[PDB]
mmCIF file of C-alpha atoms in Angstrom:
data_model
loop_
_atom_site.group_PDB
_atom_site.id
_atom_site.type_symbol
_atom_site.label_atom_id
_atom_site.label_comp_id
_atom_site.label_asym_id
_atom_site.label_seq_id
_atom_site.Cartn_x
_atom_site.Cartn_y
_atom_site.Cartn_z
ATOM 1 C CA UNK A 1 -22.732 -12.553 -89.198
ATOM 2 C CA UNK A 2 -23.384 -10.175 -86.675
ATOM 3 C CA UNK A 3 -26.226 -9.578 -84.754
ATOM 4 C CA UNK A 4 -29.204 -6.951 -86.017
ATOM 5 C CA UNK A 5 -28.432 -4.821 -82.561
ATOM 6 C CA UNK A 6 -25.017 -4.267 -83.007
ATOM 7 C CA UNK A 7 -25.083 -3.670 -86.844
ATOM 8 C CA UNK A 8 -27.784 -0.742 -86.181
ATOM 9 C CA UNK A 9 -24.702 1.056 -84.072
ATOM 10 C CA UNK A 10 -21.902 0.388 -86.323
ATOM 11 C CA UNK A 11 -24.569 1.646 -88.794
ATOM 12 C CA UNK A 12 -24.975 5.363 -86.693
ATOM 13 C CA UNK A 13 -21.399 5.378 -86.205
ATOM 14 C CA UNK A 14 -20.528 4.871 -90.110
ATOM 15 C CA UNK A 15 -22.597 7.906 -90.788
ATOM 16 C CA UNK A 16 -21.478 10.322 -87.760
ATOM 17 C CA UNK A 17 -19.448 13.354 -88.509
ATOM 18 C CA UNK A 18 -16.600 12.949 -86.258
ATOM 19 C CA UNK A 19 -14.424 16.573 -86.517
ATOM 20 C CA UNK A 20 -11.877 15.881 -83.412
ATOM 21 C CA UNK A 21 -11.308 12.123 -84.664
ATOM 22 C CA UNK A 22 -7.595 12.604 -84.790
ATOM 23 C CA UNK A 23 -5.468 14.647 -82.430
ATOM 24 C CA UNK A 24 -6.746 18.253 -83.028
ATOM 25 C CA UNK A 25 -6.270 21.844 -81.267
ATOM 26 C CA UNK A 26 -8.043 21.501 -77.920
ATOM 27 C CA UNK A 27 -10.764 23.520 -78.799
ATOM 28 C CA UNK A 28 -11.815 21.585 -81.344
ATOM 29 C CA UNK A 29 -11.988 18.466 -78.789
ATOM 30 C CA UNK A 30 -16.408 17.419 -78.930
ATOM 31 C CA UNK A 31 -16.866 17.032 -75.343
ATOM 32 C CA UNK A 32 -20.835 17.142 -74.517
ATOM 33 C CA UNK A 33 -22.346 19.019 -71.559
ATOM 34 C CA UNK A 34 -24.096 15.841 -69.504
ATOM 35 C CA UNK A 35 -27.745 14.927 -70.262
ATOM 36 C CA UNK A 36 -29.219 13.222 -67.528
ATOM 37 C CA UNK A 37 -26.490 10.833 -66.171
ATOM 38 C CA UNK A 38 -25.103 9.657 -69.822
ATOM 39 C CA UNK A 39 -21.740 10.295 -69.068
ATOM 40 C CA UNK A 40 -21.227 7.214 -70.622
ATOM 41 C CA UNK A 41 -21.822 8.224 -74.104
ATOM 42 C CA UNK A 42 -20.750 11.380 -73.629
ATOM 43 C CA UNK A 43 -17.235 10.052 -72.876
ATOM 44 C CA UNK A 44 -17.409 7.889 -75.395
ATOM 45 C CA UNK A 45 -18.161 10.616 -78.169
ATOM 46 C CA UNK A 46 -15.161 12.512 -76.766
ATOM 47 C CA UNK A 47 -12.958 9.495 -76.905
ATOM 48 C CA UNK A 48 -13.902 9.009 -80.684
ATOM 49 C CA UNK A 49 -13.952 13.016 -81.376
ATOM 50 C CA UNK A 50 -17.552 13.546 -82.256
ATOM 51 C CA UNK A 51 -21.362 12.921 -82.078
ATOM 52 C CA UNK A 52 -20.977 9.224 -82.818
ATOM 53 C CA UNK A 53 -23.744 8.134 -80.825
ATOM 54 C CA UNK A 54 -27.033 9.670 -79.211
ATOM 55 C CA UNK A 55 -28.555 8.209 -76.367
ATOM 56 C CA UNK A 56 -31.180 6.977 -78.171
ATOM 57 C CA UNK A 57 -29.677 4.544 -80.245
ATOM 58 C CA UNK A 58 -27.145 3.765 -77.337
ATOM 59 C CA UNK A 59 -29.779 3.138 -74.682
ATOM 60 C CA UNK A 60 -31.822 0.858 -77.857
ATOM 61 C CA UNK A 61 -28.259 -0.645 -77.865
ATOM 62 C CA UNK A 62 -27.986 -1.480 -74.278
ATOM 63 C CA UNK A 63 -31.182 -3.206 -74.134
ATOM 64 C CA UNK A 64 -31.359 -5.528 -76.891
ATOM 65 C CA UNK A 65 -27.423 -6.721 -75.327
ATOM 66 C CA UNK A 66 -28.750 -7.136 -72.010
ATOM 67 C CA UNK A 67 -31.341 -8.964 -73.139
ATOM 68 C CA UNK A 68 -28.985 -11.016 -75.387
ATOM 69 C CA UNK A 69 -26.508 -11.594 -72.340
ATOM 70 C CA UNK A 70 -29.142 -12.907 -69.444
ATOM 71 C CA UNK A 71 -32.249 -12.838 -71.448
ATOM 72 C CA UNK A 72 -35.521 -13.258 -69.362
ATOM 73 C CA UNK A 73 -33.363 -13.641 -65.961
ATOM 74 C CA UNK A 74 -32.492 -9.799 -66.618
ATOM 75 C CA UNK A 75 -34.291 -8.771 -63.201
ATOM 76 C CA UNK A 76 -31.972 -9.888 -61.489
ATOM 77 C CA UNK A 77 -29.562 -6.697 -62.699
ATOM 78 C CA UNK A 78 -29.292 -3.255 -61.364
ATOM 79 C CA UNK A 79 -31.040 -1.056 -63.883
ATOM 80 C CA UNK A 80 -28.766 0.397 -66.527
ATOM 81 C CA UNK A 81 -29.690 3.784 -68.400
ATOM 82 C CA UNK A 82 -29.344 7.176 -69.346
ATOM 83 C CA UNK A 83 -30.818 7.873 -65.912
ATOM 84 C CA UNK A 84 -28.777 5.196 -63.645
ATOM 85 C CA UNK A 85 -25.726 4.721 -65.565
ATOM 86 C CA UNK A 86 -23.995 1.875 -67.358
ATOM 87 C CA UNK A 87 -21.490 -0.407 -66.663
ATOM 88 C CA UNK A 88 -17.470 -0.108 -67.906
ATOM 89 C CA UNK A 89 -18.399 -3.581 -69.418
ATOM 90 C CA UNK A 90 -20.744 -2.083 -72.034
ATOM 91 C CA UNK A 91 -18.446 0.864 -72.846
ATOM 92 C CA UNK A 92 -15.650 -1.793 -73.852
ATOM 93 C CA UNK A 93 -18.068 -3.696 -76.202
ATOM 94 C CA UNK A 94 -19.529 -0.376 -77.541
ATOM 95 C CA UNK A 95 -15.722 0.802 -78.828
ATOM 96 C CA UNK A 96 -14.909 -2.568 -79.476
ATOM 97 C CA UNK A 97 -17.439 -3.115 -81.956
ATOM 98 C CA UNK A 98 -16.279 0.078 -84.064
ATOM 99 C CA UNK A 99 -12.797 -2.017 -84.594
ATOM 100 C CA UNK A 100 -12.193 -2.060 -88.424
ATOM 101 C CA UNK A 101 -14.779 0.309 -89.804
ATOM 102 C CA UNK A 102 -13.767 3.069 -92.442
ATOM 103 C CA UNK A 103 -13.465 5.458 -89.471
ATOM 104 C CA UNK A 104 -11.073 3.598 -87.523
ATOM 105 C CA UNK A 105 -8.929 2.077 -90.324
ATOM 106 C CA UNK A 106 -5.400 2.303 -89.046
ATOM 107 C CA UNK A 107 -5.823 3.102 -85.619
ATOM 108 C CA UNK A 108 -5.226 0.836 -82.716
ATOM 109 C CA UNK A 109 -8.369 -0.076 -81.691
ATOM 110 C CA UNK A 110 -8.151 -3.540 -79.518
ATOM 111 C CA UNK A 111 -10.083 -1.768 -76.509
ATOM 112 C CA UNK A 112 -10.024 -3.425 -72.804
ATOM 113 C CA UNK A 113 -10.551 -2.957 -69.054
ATOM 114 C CA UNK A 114 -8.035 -2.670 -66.028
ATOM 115 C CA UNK A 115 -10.460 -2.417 -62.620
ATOM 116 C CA UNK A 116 -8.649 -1.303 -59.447
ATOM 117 C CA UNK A 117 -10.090 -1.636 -55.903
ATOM 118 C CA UNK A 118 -8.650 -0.685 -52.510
ATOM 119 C CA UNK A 119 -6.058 -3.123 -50.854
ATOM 120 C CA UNK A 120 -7.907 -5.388 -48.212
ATOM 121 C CA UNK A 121 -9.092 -3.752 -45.218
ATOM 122 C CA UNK A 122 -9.031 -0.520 -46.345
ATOM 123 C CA UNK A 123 -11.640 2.245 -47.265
ATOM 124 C CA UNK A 124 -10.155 3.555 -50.496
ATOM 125 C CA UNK A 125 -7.216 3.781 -53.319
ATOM 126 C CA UNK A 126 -3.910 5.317 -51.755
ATOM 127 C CA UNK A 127 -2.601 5.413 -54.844
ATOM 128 C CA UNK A 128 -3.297 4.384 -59.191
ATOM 129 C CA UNK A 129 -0.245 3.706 -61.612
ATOM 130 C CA UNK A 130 -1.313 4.185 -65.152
ATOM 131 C CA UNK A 131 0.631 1.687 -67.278
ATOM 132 C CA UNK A 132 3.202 2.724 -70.036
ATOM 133 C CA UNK A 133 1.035 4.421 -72.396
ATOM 134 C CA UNK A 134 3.295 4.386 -75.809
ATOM 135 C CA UNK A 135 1.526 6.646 -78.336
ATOM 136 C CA UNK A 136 -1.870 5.332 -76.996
ATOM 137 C CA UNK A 137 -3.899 8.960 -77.214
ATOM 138 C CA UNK A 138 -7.613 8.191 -75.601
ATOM 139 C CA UNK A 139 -8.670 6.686 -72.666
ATOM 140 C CA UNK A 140 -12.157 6.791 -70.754
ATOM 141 C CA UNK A 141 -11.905 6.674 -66.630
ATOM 142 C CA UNK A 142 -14.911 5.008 -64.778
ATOM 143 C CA UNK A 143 -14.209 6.523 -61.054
ATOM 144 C CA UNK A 144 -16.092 6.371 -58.039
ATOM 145 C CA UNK A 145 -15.418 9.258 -55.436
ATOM 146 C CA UNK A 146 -16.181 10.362 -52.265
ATOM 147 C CA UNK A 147 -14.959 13.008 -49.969
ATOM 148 C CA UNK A 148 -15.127 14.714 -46.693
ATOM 149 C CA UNK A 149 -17.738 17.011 -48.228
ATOM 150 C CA UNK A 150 -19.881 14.389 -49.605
ATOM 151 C CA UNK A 151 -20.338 12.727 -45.744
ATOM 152 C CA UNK A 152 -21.196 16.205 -44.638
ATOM 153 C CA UNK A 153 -23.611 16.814 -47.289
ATOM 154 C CA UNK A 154 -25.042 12.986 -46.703
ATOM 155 C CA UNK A 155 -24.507 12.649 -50.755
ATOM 156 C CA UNK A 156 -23.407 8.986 -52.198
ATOM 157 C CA UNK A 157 -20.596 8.392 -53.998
ATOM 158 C CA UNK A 158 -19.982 9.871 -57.327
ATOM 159 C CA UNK A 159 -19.597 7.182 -60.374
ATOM 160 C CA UNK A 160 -18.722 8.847 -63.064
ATOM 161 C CA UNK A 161 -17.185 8.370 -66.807
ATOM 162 C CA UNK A 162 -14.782 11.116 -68.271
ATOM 163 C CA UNK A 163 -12.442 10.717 -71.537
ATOM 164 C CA UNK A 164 -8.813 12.359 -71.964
ATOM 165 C CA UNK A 165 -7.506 12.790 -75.336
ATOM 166 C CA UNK A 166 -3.976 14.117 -76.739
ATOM 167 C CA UNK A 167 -4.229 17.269 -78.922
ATOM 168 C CA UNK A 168 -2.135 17.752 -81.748
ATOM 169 C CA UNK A 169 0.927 18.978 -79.674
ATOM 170 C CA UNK A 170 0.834 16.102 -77.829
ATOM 171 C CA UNK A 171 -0.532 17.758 -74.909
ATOM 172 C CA UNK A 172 -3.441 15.322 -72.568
ATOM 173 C CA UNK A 173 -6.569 16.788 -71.949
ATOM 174 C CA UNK A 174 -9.235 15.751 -69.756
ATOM 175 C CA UNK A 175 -13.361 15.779 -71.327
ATOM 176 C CA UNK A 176 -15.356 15.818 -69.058
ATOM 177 C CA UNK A 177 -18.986 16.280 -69.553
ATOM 178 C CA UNK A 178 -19.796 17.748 -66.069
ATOM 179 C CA UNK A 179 -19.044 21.161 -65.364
ATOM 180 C CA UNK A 180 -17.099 20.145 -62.082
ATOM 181 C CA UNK A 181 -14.142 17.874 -61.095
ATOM 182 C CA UNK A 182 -15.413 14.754 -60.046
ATOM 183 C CA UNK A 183 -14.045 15.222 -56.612
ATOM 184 C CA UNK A 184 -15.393 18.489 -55.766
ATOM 185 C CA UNK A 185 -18.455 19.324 -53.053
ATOM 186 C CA UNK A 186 -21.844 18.122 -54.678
ATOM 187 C CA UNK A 187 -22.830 21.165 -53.895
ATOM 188 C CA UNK A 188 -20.693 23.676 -55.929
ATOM 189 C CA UNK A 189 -21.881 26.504 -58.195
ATOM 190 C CA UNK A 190 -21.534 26.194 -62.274
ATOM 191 C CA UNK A 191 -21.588 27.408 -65.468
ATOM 192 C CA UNK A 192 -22.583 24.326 -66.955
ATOM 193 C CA UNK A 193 -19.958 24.376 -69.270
ATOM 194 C CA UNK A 194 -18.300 20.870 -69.865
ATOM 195 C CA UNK A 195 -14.622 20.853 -68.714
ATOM 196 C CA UNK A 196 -11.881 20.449 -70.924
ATOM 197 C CA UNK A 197 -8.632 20.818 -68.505
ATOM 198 C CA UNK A 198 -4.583 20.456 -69.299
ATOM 199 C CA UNK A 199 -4.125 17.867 -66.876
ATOM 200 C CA UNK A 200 -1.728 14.209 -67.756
ATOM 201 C CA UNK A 201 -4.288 11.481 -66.480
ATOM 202 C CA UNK A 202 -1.777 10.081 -63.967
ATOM 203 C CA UNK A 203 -1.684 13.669 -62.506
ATOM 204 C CA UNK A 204 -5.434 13.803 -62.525
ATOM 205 C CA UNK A 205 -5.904 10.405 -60.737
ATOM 206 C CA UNK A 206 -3.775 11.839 -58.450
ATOM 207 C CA UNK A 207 -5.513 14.922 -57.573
ATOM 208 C CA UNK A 208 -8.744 12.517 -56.368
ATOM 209 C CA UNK A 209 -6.309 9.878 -54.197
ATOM 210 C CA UNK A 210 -5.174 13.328 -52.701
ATOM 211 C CA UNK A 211 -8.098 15.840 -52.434
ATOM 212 C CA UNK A 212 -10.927 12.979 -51.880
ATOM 213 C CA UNK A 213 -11.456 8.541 -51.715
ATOM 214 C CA UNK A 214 -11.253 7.155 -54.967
ATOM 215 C CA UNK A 215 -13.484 3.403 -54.380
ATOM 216 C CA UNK A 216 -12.756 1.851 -57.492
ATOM 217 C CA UNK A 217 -11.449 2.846 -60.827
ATOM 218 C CA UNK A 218 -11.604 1.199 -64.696
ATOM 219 C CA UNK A 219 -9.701 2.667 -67.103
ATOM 220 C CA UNK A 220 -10.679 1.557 -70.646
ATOM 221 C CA UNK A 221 -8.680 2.435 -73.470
ATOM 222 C CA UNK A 222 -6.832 1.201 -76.575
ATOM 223 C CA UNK A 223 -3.744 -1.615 -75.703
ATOM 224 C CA UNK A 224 -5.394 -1.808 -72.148
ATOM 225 C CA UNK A 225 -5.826 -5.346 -70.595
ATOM 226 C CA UNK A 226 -6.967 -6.414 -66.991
ATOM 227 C CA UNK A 227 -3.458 -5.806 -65.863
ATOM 228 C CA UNK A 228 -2.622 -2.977 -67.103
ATOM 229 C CA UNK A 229 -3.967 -0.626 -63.854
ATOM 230 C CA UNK A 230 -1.249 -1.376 -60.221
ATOM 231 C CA UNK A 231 -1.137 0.497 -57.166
ATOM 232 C CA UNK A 232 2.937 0.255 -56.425
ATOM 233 C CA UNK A 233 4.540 3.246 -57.532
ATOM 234 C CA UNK A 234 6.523 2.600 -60.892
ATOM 235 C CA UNK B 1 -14.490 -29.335 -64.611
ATOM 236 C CA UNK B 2 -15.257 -26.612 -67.041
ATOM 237 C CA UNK B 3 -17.532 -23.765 -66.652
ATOM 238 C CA UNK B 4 -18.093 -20.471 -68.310
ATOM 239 C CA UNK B 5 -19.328 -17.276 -67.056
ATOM 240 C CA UNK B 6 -20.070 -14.635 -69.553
ATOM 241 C CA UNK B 7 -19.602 -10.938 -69.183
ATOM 242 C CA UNK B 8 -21.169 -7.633 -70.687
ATOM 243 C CA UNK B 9 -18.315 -7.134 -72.705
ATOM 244 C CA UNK B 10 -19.514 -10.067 -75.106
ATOM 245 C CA UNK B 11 -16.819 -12.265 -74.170
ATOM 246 C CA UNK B 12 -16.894 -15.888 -72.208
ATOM 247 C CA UNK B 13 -14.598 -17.076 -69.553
ATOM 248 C CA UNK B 14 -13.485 -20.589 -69.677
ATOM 249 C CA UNK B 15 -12.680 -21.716 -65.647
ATOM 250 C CA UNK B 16 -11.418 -25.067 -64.233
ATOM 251 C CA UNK B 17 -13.489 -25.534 -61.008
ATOM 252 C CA UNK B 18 -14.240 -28.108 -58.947
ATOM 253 C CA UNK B 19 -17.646 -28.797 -57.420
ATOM 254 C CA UNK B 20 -15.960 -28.277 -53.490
ATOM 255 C CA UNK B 21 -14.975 -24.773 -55.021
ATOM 256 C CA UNK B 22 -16.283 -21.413 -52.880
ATOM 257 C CA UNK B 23 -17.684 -18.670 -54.843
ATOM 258 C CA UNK B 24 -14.826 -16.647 -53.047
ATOM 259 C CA UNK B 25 -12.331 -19.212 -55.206
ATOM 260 C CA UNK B 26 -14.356 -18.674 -58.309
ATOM 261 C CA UNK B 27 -13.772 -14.629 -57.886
ATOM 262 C CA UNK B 28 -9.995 -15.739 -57.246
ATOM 263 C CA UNK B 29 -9.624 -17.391 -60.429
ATOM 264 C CA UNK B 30 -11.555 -14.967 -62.858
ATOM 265 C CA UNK B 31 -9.094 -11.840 -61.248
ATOM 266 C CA UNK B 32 -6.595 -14.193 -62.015
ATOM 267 C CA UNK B 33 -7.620 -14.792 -65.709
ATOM 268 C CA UNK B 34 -9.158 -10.984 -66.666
ATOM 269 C CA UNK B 35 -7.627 -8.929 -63.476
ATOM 270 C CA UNK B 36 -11.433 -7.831 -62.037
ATOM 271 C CA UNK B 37 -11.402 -7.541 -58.628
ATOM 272 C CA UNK B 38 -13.357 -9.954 -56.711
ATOM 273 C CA UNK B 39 -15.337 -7.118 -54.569
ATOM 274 C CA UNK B 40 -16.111 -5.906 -57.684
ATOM 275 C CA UNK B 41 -17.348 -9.117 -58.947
ATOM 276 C CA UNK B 42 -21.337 -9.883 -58.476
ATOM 277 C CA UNK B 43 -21.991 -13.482 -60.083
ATOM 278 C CA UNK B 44 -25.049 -14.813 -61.230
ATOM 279 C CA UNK B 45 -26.681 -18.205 -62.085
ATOM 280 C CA UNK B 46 -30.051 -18.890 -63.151
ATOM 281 C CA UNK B 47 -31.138 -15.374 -62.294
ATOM 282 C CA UNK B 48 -29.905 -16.417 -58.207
ATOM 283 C CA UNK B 49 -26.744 -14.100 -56.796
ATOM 284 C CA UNK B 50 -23.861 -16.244 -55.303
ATOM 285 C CA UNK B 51 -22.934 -15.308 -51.966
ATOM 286 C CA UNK B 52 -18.765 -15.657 -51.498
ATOM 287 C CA UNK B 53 -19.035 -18.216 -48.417
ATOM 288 C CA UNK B 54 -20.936 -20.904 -50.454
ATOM 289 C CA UNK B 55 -19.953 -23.313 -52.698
ATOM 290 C CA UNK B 56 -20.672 -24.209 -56.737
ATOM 291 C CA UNK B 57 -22.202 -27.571 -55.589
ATOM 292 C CA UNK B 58 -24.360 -25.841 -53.187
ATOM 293 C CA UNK B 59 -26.024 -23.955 -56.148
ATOM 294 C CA UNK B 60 -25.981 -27.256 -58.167
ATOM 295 C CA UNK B 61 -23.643 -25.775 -60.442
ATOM 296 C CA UNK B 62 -22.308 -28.605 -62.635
ATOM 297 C CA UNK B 63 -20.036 -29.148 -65.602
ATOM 298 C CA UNK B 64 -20.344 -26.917 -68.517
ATOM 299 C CA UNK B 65 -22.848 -24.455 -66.687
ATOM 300 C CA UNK B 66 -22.773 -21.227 -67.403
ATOM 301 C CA UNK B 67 -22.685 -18.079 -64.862
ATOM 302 C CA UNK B 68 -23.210 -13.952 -65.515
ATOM 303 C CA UNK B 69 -20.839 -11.996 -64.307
ATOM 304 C CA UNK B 70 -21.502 -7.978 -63.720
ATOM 305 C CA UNK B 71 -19.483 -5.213 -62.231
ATOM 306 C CA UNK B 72 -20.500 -3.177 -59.644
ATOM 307 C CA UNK B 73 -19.582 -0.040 -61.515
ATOM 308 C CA UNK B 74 -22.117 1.959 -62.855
ATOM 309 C CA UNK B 75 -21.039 5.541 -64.611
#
């Protein structure tokens, strides 16, 4: 039925303790300070509320499906790893393939992809309109950032995941496994602490179309199709 | 004619093309199927990238081939 590679991580998965699985207090959220540039999995362990997977076994993942997916053509991809990053593509099959185990029985789980880019002829986003939501309560945001401080510093473009999840008084948080907003100077001092801010995600998108040039964005979440992302106001 | 282009996500687009059809037209119709937009659309066939300007016969791309699609995101 299905394929040894994606059995082994619904395998991890079935046997993960997942504390923050349903809407809990916000400190009892599992959001992972970044290893390397994993954001990926570390978003996706906040989105399903606990260590579900390690790199290892995502990275062994990732492999064995790009090699399923373009076989011996794939050097002709952009590497994709714990050190480089992975695309919102992967993310979507990873949650995907967790639909109807024992730990998601009953929750919507039909995961997809809405990509935004800038309107033709110009540098950046002006402006993101989440869809309706309904009682949807996770999402992971793929952005890439610059800024004015960026071009000074001669630093690239941040791409970057982060997950937002509702607490139990309904409240959206953002999880973000860095220690700084994604729009702030490359630069900046930290604790190292991951950040876990009080912030609605359309008021977060937001504060990057304002304070710095949002590139592209995916947002990936349950109920979430390709056009679920505009950038008309609503 | 039909062609498919697969995608990381495990799933396979079904297109109607014809062989006079730019790789800019090809982006056109997968945003129009799955919403991706075309700048952020990097296709692939037989391990060769397809520039936007040329056309599917001028990659010999015939009925039923089959094309990889990847973002250019990378978190």
């Amino acid at each position: 039925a299905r394929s040894p590679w994606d059995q082994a991580l619904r395998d991890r998965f079935d046997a993960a303790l997942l504390p923050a699985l349903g809407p809990v207090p916000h400190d009892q959220f599992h959001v992972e300070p970044q290893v390397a540039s994993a954001c990926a999995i570390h978003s996706i362990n906040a989105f399903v509320g606990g260590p579900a997977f390690d790199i290892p076994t995502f990275t062994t993942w990732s492999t064995a499906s790009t090699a399923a997916f373009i076989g011996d053509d794939a050097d002709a991809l952009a590497p994709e790893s714990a050190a480089s990053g992975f695309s919102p593509h992967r993310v979507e099959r990873a949650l995907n393939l967790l639909d109807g185990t024992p730990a998601t029985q009953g929750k919507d789980w039909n995961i997809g992809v809405s990509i935004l880019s800038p309107r033709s002829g110009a540098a950046m986003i002006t402006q993101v309109t989440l869809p309706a939501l309904g009682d949807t309560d996770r999402l992971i945001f793929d952005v890439k950032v610059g800024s004015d401080a960026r071009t000074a510093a001669g630093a690239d473009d941040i791409d970057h995941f982060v997950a937002f999840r509702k607490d139990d008084q309904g409240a959206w948080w953002l999880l973000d496994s860095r220690s700084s907003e994604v729009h702030a100077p490359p630069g900046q001092e930290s604790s190292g602490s991951p950040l876990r801010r009080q912030i609605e995600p359309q008021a977060w998108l937001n504060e990057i179309t304002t304070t710095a040039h949002l590139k592209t964005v995916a947002l990936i979440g349950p109920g979430i199709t390709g056009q679920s992302l505009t950038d008309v106001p609503r | 004619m039909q062609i498919f282009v697969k995608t990381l996500t495990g799933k396979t687009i079904t297109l109607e093309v014809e062989p006079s059809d730019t790789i800019e037209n090809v982006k056109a119709k997968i945003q129009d199927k799955e919403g991706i937009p075309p700048d952020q659309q990097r296709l692939i066939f037989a391990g060769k990238q397809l520039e936007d300007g040329r056309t599917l016969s001028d990659y010999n791309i015939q009925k039923e081939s089959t094309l990889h699609l990847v973002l250019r995101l990378r978190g």
